[PDB]
Amino acid sequence: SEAVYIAIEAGTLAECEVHEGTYFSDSGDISEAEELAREKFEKGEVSNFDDVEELVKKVVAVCEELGAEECFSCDFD
């Protein structure tokens, strides 16, 4: 599903645009990613027309699947 990536790409987490593979979701509020995802998603029906509770759940899952909280590459030349 891409709807998730979009829901999260809508502004759920952040990743170094100079370091591909290195990501980092708003640390301190992982749930915020879901809520925000539900806000954008709900504030903008996606083609997939999936469920909010589903997206959010998938938003927290994906976000968690990224297990990223910083761009260690920031030190990797």
At residue 54, what is the residue type? E
With binding defined as CB under 5 A, does residue 68 bind Zn ion? Answer: no
User: Among residues 36, 55, 62, 71, which is the contact residue for Zn ion, using CB under 5 A?
Assistant: 71
Best CA proximity match to 40, nearest among 1, 60, 10, 5? 10
Interface characters, 8-37, with Zn ion (x: CB under 5 A): --------x--x------------------
d(CA 24, CA 68): 4
d(CA 69, CA 62) in angstroms, rounded, equals: 13
From the CB of 71, what's the least distance to Zn ion, in Å? 3
Q: What residues line the site for Zn ion (CB under 5 A)? A: 16, 19, 71, 73-74
